[PDB]
Design a protein around this ligand. Structure first.
Ligand SMILES: CCCCCCCCCCCCCCCCCC(=O)OC[C@H](COP(=O)([O-])OCC[N+](C)(C)C)OC(=O)CCCCCCCCCCCCCCCCC
Ligand SMILES: CCCCCCCCCCCCCCCCCC(=O)OC[C@H](COP(=O)([O-])OCC[N+](C)(C)C)OC(=O)CCCCCCCCCCCCCCCCC
Ligand SMILES: CCCCCCCCCCCCCCCCCC(=O)OC[C@H](COP(=O)(O)OCCN)OC(=O)CCCCCCCCCCCCCCCCC
Ligand SMILES: CCCCCCCCCCCCCCCCCC(=O)OC[C@H](COP(=O)(O)OCCN)OC(=O)CCCCCCCCCCCCCCCCC
Ligand SMILES: CCCCCCCCCCCCCCCCCC(=O)OC[C@H](COP(=O)(O)OCCN)OC(=O)CCCCCCCCCCCCCCCCC
Ligand SMILES: CCCCCCCCCCCCCCCCCC(=O)OC[C@H](COP(=O)(O)OCCN)OC(=O)CCCCCCCCCCCCCCCCC
Ligand SMILES: CCCCCCCCCCCCCCCCCC(=O)OC[C@H](COP(=O)(O)OCCN)OC(=O)CCCCCCCCCCCCCCCCC
Ligand SMILES: CCCCCCCCCCCCCCCCCC(=O)OC[C@H](COP(=O)(O)OCCN)OC(=O)CCCCCCCCCCCCCCCCC
Ligand SMILES: COCC(CCO[C@H]1CC[C@@]2(C)C(=CC[C@H]3[C@@H]4C[C@@H]5O[C@]6(CC[C@@H](C)CO6)[C@@H](C)[C@@H]5[C@@]4(C)CC[C@@H]32)C1)COC
Ligand SMILES: COc1ccc(CCN(C)CCC[C@@](C#N)(c2ccc(OC)c(OC)c2)C(C)C)cc1OC
Ligand SMILES: CC(=O)N[C@@H]1[C@@H](O)[C@H](O)[C@@H](CO)O[C@H]1O
Ligand SMILES: [Ca+2]
Ligand SMILES: [Ca+2]
Lengths: 1274, 49, 46
């Protein structure tokens, strides 16, 4: 604090000034400035309201207040450098930066009279972090968890780059042609269709619009924003796809231009690989990091803080129950109501009248009968006074005071008072057409009365309130992040979405509330790319600086989502930990109490039994499941559909033969083998049966034992979610009711938003193409209903599920914000406070969703390690280091003989080589991401000069490597084979490009694959990669469940919706359909990824236009659709989500050894480098080496495994003889047992005489030795 | 003997013995196209038309 | 003037799919294999 050598205290009582409220005055000052940056209104083209002026005037005050304190802290502390001490703190640097920047902009502005320097004010809120010394700590734990993500960052960065370049070449400049009306410069497109590439002759799609021709001076698919013309745009589009928002759009445009036969590979691989795989890796590393951190807490002291105070509370309520009965314990009927209150009669008849008020609320729908309205009010009346009397009889029957005591009782007071308060209210005459409603729903609150009898709910609630209490400081930071970005938005995009079109952009940054909503939207990732496009167009378009705004959105999404990760991960980890910790604690509390009151027939079995029979049958399921998928949906009169029908009658004779032979030997899974066989012979309502004919791939779950056991595990995961799901389904229902009370009959509108009534929307109206008062067409007027509404409780609910999948929730949000009056069209921006409802729901759901997901994880853990125990003398770190020491092995370095070959071997193995090659591959990379569309002809030939010259260089390195490994050790390293592959292909590429011009866009992809070599040096990336790529192989059955999922669904899907016509502007078209098997599977992947599935669902409903090929009575073209699409889609979504979370958990767990390793103490990462130094003493393994090289082995070792940064003369000389080792002949001590006592020393270190006791333990808890420990015992 | 005398590597290597000759069936037979004007019916290939 | 292939496109499209996929599978059937444990290594002693 004190300088200890400053100037005197002539004024340096400034350190006296700064006591209690100056820390708060300044805090509220930094808060009011926040409230000021937000009331500002961004106006376009330089306009300005008189209030913004007032705000600028107040800005000077704010400035002078932040600028004097930045001098009154360089007074205290000390001289230039003692003020530096002030600057010693990182935070002050930011404070100084702020204020300084400020006055800077101010003075500049003044002199001029810059519009950018004003964007730096949105930094002041940050200052709100230096204050709250709590927010500081959270910001700290956020940066430490992010430290171990470095290896994943590299990976993701290189993935995008690789794909970006492949994208480049593959489709660079292929999206510049679109359909045009002949002669004009106008784009021809249907209604709800987006302009897309086209092609004149080729695999692409042709023009279909009348009087339309294929031109080619088109800027691109998204206003010239989404394409692969250069490395920048290529990169942007790739990232956009990786986020999974609008990826299919890009996939369809590339088809429409190149043909759909191949571009699918690229995209699916990306989404799959990049997206999902990367997600898994990130979720895993973070999970690991969190576990170690929690471990740091629980082993230090934090277990007894939550156990005592949960026990000292439950002992408090027991102490206060011994008081409150001792204080309580005039006529006879007041004791007969004491007998009844706690009985079991009254418990079963509070649930009777609560179930009459739940049914009424649910009953409330739009346009309900008159007897229904009457009946509902009637019941509420027959209930308000019934609620009056029990309360009346309760408070007067057992005492007026201890009625006050009940938590539940307090609410029973609130019901009838506000229950009868609305009786005269709605009668007064005020209210209005929106309050009389919000009042009505409240009746819903009565269900909470039942909670009193619901013991589970009471507790689980406290459990949920604890997790939301810990992450409190993280949550504040999230809001602080949101507000700041909302402000930055208001600054870069406020008042700029002023394009001269008639297209409405509801998601902008015109004011604070709207900007908040838009930020939240970009945060959920729903339609974020569309939001970005507007921002880009607000700066001219996709040009140099104009595009650089996209960096704002990237940052937003990425970072905000990282904070979300922390929140969710922290909640789960703390929550899961508490559940394991206190549920087990209440279990050790449990049965310790219950112990206290206690104290010819044989050869057909041979064939059936025989193994070959199975491999002869499981490739008749492989043929019969290809016959279900090869069927043609639209044309039943095809020769294909006939000649596949004979393949029907082939196999379902053979499975019959399997059936009858099975009931020759033997007398639940075999009632499924009976059913499949009968269905075909019957099928040769027929229609219903056919769907039930795809069940065949479900009869292969018994033949394989692997499949049988995993459907059992999945079915066991849906049994440990009871209290949480119950709370969650209660939430969904409640919100559905609130929605019906808020938006009932308000989701109706007219074609032209001029008519507000159904009476009004009659006749015809004009539409204007591209808002041209001169180009209009006539259209009929129609009163339309939104597909997802809140008319009844079954509707509002479907709506909420879709709003919960984040798919199309902004649309619903805006329709709601526009809601007017019942039976009246929308009023632009009518009530913006509905956004509140929408945001709260999303949040609450997110929370509860996470808990349910975590609980399922805990059950799985119990299925695995949680259920298991291992209390032997050796702990976790011993099993993963001693069992490795038993099962180790030597290597193969291949140091060859002779100077000529040996010297060559040396140059190539030298570091000058590693680095050089690396540098060259980096240059080749830079030269690849340099190609663009519309370069020069001198650029055109030096790209073939260079790609033949790089080939040369690389084919010249391989030569050296080969000469230095006699070809035996060259092709021995798995990376050298990859090198060889690349080289050869690269050369062929050149020769091709040559025999082309002397007289295949697959060979130019061999240049790019070189980058993978980089993965040959990166040892953290390579290692992490292997780790996971090794788990996805230990769990190949869960993946099989997913595959089987898509198969069954695709087949059922085709059958059910394979005839709908492929019309443009709809969701069922040439890119999305169930016409062929491959296409159906693509559609489902699109759905699993969540790409506008709800719109597909609606596209697959009843009244759909039939394919011309499909047959139908002349006058039944519109009968094709099925309302079964609701069960099909919702069910697929849920099951899919379930299986996916089950695959991530699996992998992560099976990898928790490396994840939660706390790389500090030990791992096999030391045990690897031992052998890589031992490889310099073994050419090939042989077991043992000389003893002269043993002391030179210990000099090479890291000191947590071997010996220190000291000199080896005292510790390393004495210990190597004194600690045990096997003594064979002079230069023979083995690999297999030197590594033992070298790691038996570092931990699990023992006294003498019990050298058999380490070998005693290495046979029981360890796997069978295999006879190798007989030198590892001695 | 473990990567060269396993059956799973010889089922595959005998499968290549099928594709070594079917790609030789194609590279001599010129029958993978039909010109059909309607006679001028021509059958294309690599070497002979 | 039309097109139809009968005898030697679907021959070579059965020798493409044979050689392209009997090559990648021979590759994964010929390498040492993933270790599956920390001690195991790709390309090692024996
Ligand atoms: C290890 C962990 C495991 C994790 C498990 C997670 C995996 C989840 C699975 C999702 C993957 C999604 C795959 C989507 C498939 C995309 C196919 C596609 O869109 O093609 C469109 C088109 C289909 O043509 P088309 O029928 O649209 O043609 C119509 C022409 N126009 C459009 C002009 C009218 O491309 C093709 O023709 C390629 C054929 C598809 C073959 C690819 C295999 C697909 C999957 C198996 C079905 C194939 C049957 C057997 C094939 C025999 C071998 C060749
Ligand atoms: C054999 C299977 C692959 C064949 C690909 C092919 O032939 O494409 C030609 C076609 C060429 O299209 P085309 O033949 O229509 O030609 C386009 C225009 N002209 C005619 C002028 C050339 O390429 C494609 O259209 C799609 C290519 C998909 C390839 C996907 C590779 C990426 C997936 C792996 C990434 C690995 C990441 C590792 C980390
Ligand atoms: C302890 C923690 C310490 C830090 C706490 C967090 C600090 C927050 C600082 C930012 C607070 C700003 C909110 C107050 C404000 O000024 O909001 C102004 C905004 C104006 O909107 P309004 O006037 O209603 O008109 C809308 C159409 N023009 O009104 C609104 O839009 C309100 C929107 C809801 C905000 C949530
Ligand atoms: C990184 C983020 C994005 C990088 C920006 C790349 C870029 O802007 O490239 C555009 C440029 C196109 O050239 P242009 O002038 O538009 O052609 C006009 C002719 N009508 O083409 C270029 O000049 C791009 C050259 C640089 C791109 C190569 C980067 C590859 C990096 C790989 C790293 C390896 C690890
Ligand atoms: C915690 C987070 C705290 C972050 C707060 C720090 C604020 C960051 C300062 C960003 C200020 C950007 C200033 C550049 C700018 O406003 O644009 C200048 C230029 C103007 O061009 P104009 O004529 O207005 O538009 C037509 C274009 N033909 O148009 C351009 O040149 C485009 C440049 C816009 C780039 C904006 C980058 C924002 C990055 C957000 C980081 C978070
Ligand atoms: C350019 C390269 C950017 C890297 C992008 C990573 C790709 C993330 C991903 O796999 O996306 C999938 C997922 C889709 O989620 P969905 O709900 O389908 O939409 O999208 C997500 O779930 C988003 C998860 C993003 C988490 C990012 C974590 C990486 C660490 C970033 C550290 C930087 C943040 C600093 C924050 C400090 C706070 C002030
Ligand atoms: C319990 C979970 C259910 C989740 C909530 C779904 C609610 C959707 C709903 O209520 O659908 C009713 C829907 C309403 O119809 P409406 O929008 O008014 O349109 C006019 C229709 N002619 O009209 C309908 O017909 C929809 C009825 C179909 C109900 C969906 C079927 C759900 C199947 C889920 C099975 C998977 C469960 C496995 C879970 C694994 C992990 C969670
Ligand atoms: C293609 C043919 C073969 C190409 C693969 C060559 C690289 C390889 O197979 O190595 C896998 C490598 C093995 O892991 P390793 O470090 O040996 O395990 C020691 C135990 N800690 O660990 C890895 O798996 C590294 C990541 C391999 C994925 C590379 C993708 C290649 C596809 C192109
Ligand atoms: O101890 C355990 C506490 C729970 C925790 C943190 C553990 C491992 C896997 C973790 C899960 C990975 C899944 O990954 C996710 C994200 C991706 C989704 C496909 C579903 O699975 C999470 C919901 C799931 C997850 C984050 C829920 C929480 C889990 C360790
Ligand atoms: C159809 O099934 C699925 C489809 C897609 C995905 C990918 C996304 N996963 C749901 C993980 C998203 C969940 C999560 C992440 N990451 C996330 C939560 C909320 C988010 O926004 C508020 C968010 O999306 C940006 C991501 C949390 C729970 C960690 C998973 C699926 O199974 C869960
Ligand atoms: C401008 C134009 O192409 N008009 C055409 C017309 O010639 C044709 O008779 C009809 C049938 O396709 O479709 C329309
Ligand atoms: Ca989304
Ligand atoms: Ca979407």
């Amino acid at each position: 604090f004190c300088l200890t050598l400053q100037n005197p205290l002539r004024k340096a009582c400034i350190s006296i000034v700064e006591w209690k409220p100056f820390e708060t005055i300044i805090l509220l000052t930094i808060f009011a400035n926040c409230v000021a940056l937000a009331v500002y209104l961004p106006m376009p083209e330089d306009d300005n309201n008189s209030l913004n002026l007032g705000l600028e005037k107040l800005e000077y005050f704010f400035l002078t207040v932040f600028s004097i304190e930045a001098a009154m802290k360089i007074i205290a502390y000390g001289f230039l450098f003692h003020q530096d001490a002030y600057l010693r703190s990182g935070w002050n640097v930011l404070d100084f930066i702020i204020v300084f920047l400020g006055v800077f902009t101010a003075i500049l502005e003044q002199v001029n009279v810059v519009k950018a320097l004003r964007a730096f004010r949105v930094l002041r809120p940050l200052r709100l972090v230096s204050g709250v010394p709590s927010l500081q700590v959270v910001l700290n734990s956020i940066f430490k968890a992010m430290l171990p993500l470095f290896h994943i960052a590299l990976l993701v960065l290189f993935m995008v780059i690789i794909y970006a370049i492949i994208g480049l070449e593959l489709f660079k400049g292929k999206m510049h042609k679109t359909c045009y009306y002949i002669g004009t410069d106008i784009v021809a497109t249907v209604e709800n269709e987006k302009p897309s590439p086209c092609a004149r002759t080729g695999s692409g799609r042709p023009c279909t619009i009348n009087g339309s021709e294929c031109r080619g001076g088109w800027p691109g698919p998204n206003h010239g924003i989404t394409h692969f013309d250069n490395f920048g745009f290529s990169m942007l589009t790739v990232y956009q796809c990786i986020t999974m928002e609008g990826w299919t759009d890009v996939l369809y445009w590339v088809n429409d231009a190149i043909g759909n036969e191949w571009p699918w590979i690229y995209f699916v691989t990306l989404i799959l690989l990049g997206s999902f795989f990367i997600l898994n890796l990130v979720l895993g590393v973070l999970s690991g990091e969190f576990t170690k951190e929690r471990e740091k807490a629980k082993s230090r002291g934090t277990f007894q803080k939550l156990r005592e105070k949960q026990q000292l509370e439950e002992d408090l309520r027991g102490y206060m129950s011994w008081i409150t009965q001792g204080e309580v314990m005039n006529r006879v009927f007041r004791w007969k109501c004491h007998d009844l209150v706690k009985s079991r009669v009254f418990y079963w008849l509070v649930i009777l009248i609560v179930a009459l008020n739940t049914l009424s609320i649910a009953s409330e729908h739009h346009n309900q009968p008159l007897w229904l309205t009457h009946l509902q009010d009637i019941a509420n009346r027959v209930l308000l006074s019934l609620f009056t009397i029990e309360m009346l009889l309760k408070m007067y029957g057992l005492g007026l005071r201890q009625y006050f005591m009940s938590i539940f009782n307090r609410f029973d007071c609130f019901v009838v008072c506000s229950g009868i308060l609305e009786l005269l209210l709605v009668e007064s005459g005020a209210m209005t057409p929106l309050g009389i409603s919000v009042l009505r729903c409240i009746r819903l609150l009565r269900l909470f009365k039942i909670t009193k009898y619901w013991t589970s709910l009471s507790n689980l609630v406290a459990s949920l309130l604890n997790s939301i209490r810990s992450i409190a400081s993280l949550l504040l930071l999230l809001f602080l992040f949101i507000i700041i970005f909302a402000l930055l938005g208001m600054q870069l995009f406020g008042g700029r979405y002023d394009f001269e079109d008639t297209e409405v952009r509801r998601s902008n940054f015109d004011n604070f509330p709207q900007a908040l909503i838009s930020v939240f939207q970009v945060l959920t990732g729903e339609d974020w790319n569309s939001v970005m496009y507007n921002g880009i167009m607000a700066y001219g378009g996709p040009s140099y600086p104009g595009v650089l705004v996209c960096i704002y959105f990237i940052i937003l999404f990425v970072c905000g989502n990282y904070i979300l990760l922390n929140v969710f991960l922290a909640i789960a980890v703390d929550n899961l930990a508490e559940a394991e910790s206190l549920t087990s604690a209440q279990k050790a509390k449990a049965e310790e109490r219950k112990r206290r009151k206690m104290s010819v027939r044989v050869l057909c079995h041979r064939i059936v039994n025989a193994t070959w029979f199975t491999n002869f049958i499981l490739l008749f399921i492989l043929l019969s499941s290809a016959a279900l998928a090869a069927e043609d949906p639209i044309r039943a009169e095809s020769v294909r559909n006939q000649i596949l029908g004979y393949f029907d009658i082939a196999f379902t004779s053979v499975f019959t033969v399997e059936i009858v032979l099975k009931m020759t030997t033997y007398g639940y899974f075999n009632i499924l083998d009976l059913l499949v066989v009968a269905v075909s012979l019957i099928s040769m309502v027929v229609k219903i049966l056919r769907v039930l004919r795809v069940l065949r791939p479900l009869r292969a779950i018994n033949r394989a034992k692997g499949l049988k056991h995993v459907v059992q595990c999945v079915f066991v995961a849906i049994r440990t979610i009871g209290n949480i799901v119950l709370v969650t389904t209660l939430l969904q229902f409640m919100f559905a009711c609130i929605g019906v009370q808020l938006f009932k009959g308000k989701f109706f509108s007219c074609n032209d938003l001029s008519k507000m009534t159904e009476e009004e929307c009659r006749g015809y109206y004009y539409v204007y193409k591209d808002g041209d008062p001169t180009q209009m067409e006539l259209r009929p007027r129609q009163w339309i209903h939104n597909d997802f509404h809140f008319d009844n409780v079954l509707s509002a609910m479907m709506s909420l599920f879709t709003v919960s999948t984040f798919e199309g929730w902004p649309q619903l949000l805006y329709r709601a914000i526009d809601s007017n009056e019942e039976d009246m069209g929308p009023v632009y921006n009518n009530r913006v406070e509905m956004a509140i409802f929408f945001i709260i729901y999303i949040i609450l759901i997110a929370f509860f969703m996470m808990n349910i997901f975590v609980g399922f994880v805990i059950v799985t853990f119990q299925e695995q390690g949680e259920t298991e125990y291992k209390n032997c003398e050796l702990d976790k770190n011993q099993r993963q280091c001693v069992q490795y020491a038993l099962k180790a092995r030597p290597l193969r370095c291949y140091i060859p003989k002779n100077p000529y070959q040996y010297q060559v071997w040396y140059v190539v193995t030298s570091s000058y080589f590693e680095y050089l090659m690396f540098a060259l591959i980096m240059l080749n990379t830079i030269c690849l991401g340099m190609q663009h569309y519309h370069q020069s002809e001198e650029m055109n030939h030096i790209s073939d000069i260079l790609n033949v010259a790089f080939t040369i260089i690389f084919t010249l390195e391989m030569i050296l490597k080969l000469l230095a490994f006699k070809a035996r050790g060259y092709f021995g390293d798995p990376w050298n084979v990859f090198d060889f592959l690349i080289v050869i292909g690269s050369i062929i590429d050149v020769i091709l490009s040559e025999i082309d011009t002397f007289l295949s866009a697959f060979f130019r992809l061999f240049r790019v694959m070189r980058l993978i070599k980089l993965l040959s040096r990166a040892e953290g990336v390579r290692t992490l990669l292997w780790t996971f790529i090794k788990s996805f192989q230990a769990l190949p059955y869960v993946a099989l469940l997913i595959v089987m999922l898509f198969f069954i669904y695709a087949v059922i899907g085709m059958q059910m919706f394979g005839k709908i016509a492929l019309v443009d502007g709809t969701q069922i078209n040439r890119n999305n359909n169930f016409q062929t098997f491959p296409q159906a599977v693509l559609l489902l992947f699109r759905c699993a990824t969540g790409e506008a599935w709800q719109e597909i669902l609606l596209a697959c409903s009843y009244g759909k236009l039939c394919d011309p090929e499909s047959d139908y009575a002349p006058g039944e073209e519109y009968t094709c659709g099925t309302n079964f699409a609701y069960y099909y889609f919702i069910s697929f979504y849920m099951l899919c989500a379930f299986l996916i979370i089950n695959l991530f958990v699996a992998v992560i767990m099976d990898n928790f050894d490396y994840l939660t390793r706390d790389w500090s103490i030990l791992g096999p990462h030391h045990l690897d480098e031992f052998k890589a130094i031992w490889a310099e003493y073994d050419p090939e393994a042989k077991g043992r080496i000389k003893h002269l090289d043993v002391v030179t082995l210990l000099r090479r070792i890291q000191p947590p495994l071997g010996f220190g940064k000291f000199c080896p003369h005292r510790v390393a000389c004495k210990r190597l003889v004194g600690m045990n080792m096997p003594l064979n002949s002079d230069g023979t001590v083995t690999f297999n047992a030197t590594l033992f006592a070298l790691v038996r020393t570092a931990l699990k270190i023992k006294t003498e005489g019990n050298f058999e006791q380490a070998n005693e333990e290495l046979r029981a808890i360890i796997k069978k030795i295999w006879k190798r420990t007989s030198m590892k015992l001695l | 003997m473990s990567p060269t005398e396993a059956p799973k590597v010889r089922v595959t290597l005998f499968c290549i013995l099928v594709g070594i000759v079917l790609a030789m069936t194609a590279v001599v037979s010129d029958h993978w196209a039909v010109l059909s004007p309607h006679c001028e019916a021509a059958h294309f290939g690599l070497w002979r038309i | 003037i039309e097109y139809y292939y009968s005898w030697s496109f679907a021959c070579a499209c059965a020798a493409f799919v044979l050689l392209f996929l009997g090559g990648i599978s021979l590759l994964l059937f010929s390498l040492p294999r993933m270790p599956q444990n920390p001690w195991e290594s790709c390309m090692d002693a024996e």
